[PDB]
C-alpha cells in the first residue's frame, strides 16, 4: 500500500531557492530562482524540501544538537529519509516531488507576476561604501501544491511516521525553506494537509489523516 501526502505550501516571505550560478547580465537580476523550464514557472525542488525537513526533524530527534553525518543519525530519520550505510541499508518510505506553483491564476487576477526582484546591498564597514545585490525571489502568497508518496512498509510504524512528519511540518513553519532565510526570506506555512490512498483503500486512514491534518 502506498499513500499520498497531499497539501499546499504557502509563502509568507520570499523563498529564493535555486539557480544557475552562471552570468545572467551586467545590470540585471543575478542568481534567478529555479524554474520548470518548459513552463518557466517558479519551482520548489523536492530535494530542498526533503533536505530541510530531514535537517530539522533530525535536530528535534536526537534532542538538541545534530553534529553528525546524515547517513547515521536516528532510526526514525533513517527509515523516513533513506539510508546508504555499508552493512545497514533500508529504503526511504517518502518520495518527494518537484513542486510547481499552482496559484498563477490568482496572481494574474492581481496583475502581478509570479516573481519579483529584491534589491539588497552591504556596507563595507571600513570604507562605508555600498555593494549592491539583486536576487530574484518568488512573491509572497504564492501557493505550491505538493504530493509526497508514502511507502507504507509496515503497519506498526505508520502512526509514528506521520507523528514525525507532522513534527517536521511544524518545525518548518518556524524556519525557512530555502535561500537567504535569516535575512527575511523563505518563510513558509503548510496548509490543507491530507492523506489519500493510491490504489485500493486503507482501513485506518483516519488516525493518520487527523494526526497530520491538525
Amino acid at each position: 500500500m502506498k499513500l499520498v501526502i497531499e497539501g499546499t505550501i504557502v509563502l509568507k516571505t520570499g523563498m529564493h531557492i535555486g539557480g544557475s550560478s552562471d552570468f545572467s547580465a551586467i545590470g540585471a537580476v543575478a542568481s534567478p530562482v529555479v524554474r520548470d523550464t518548459l513552463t518557466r514557472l517558479p519551482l520548489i525542488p523536492g530535494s530542498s524540501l526533503k533536505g530541510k525537513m530531514r535537517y530539522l526533524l533530525a535536530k528535534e530527534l536526537n534532542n538538541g544538537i545534530l553534529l553528525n553525518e546524515p547517513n547515521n543519525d536516528q532510526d526514525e530519520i533513517l527509515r523516513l529519509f533513506g539510508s546508504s550505510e555499508k552493512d545497514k541499508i533500508r529504503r526511504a518510505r517518502l518520495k518527494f516531488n518537484d513542486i510547481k506553483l499552482s496559484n498563477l491564476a490568482e496572481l494574474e487576477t492581481f496583475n502581478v507576476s509570479s516573481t519579483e526582484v529584491k534589491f539588497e546591498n552591504t556596507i563595507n564597514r571600513k570604507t562605508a561604501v555600498a555593494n549592491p545585490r539583486q536576487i530574484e525571489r518568488v512573491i509572497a502568497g504564492s501557493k505550491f501544491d505538493f504530493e509526497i508518496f508514502y511507502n507504507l512498509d509496515d503497519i506498526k510504524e505508520v502512526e509514528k511516521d506521520f507523528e514525525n512528519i507532522k513534527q517536521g511540518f511544524d518545525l518548518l513553519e518556524f524556519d525557512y525553506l530555502g535561500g537567504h532565510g535569516t535575512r527575511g526570506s523563505g518563510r513558509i506555512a503548510f496548509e490543507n494537509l491530507s492523506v489519500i490512498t493510491a490504489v485500493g483503500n486503507f482501513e485506518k486512514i483516519n488516525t493518520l489523516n487527523e494526526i497530520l491534518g491538525a
Binding site: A25, I26, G27, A28, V29, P32, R35, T39, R40, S113, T115, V117
Partner: protein
Amino acid sequence: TELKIGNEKVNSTNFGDFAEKAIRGINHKPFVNSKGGEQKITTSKIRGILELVNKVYNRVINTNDVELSENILADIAYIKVKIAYESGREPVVKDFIQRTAFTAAITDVMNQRTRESFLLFARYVESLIAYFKFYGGKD
C-alpha cells in the same frame, strides 16, 4: 533576428563589435558642451540607461512566446520616451544616444515586435556599458 541601425545591419555576430566600435568612436572624438573643454557622459547616466533596459530585461527572459506581449512593448515604447527625454535635457546624453545609435535600435525593436529582437537590443546595450567601463574607467 537582425536589427537595423543605419545602412549596416547588426545581428548576434556583431553587436559586441558594433558597440566596441561605437564606444571607441566616442573616445578619440568626444563631445563639447559649448564651452572650451570636452565632456563625456558619466557612469551614472549610462547606468540609468542600462537600468531602464534591465527593468524590461528582467521580465522578458522569463517569457514564453517568440512575439512580445503588449505590456512589454508598452514599456519598450516608454523606454524610448525616457531616452528621448533625458537626451533633450543634457546634450552630452544626446550625443551618446545619437552616436551609439539607440533610438533607431529601439524603434526597429518596436517594428519587429519579437523576443529575439529585444534580446539583441539588450545584449547590445549591455555590451555598450561593458565597453564603456572597459575603456578609460574611473573606478
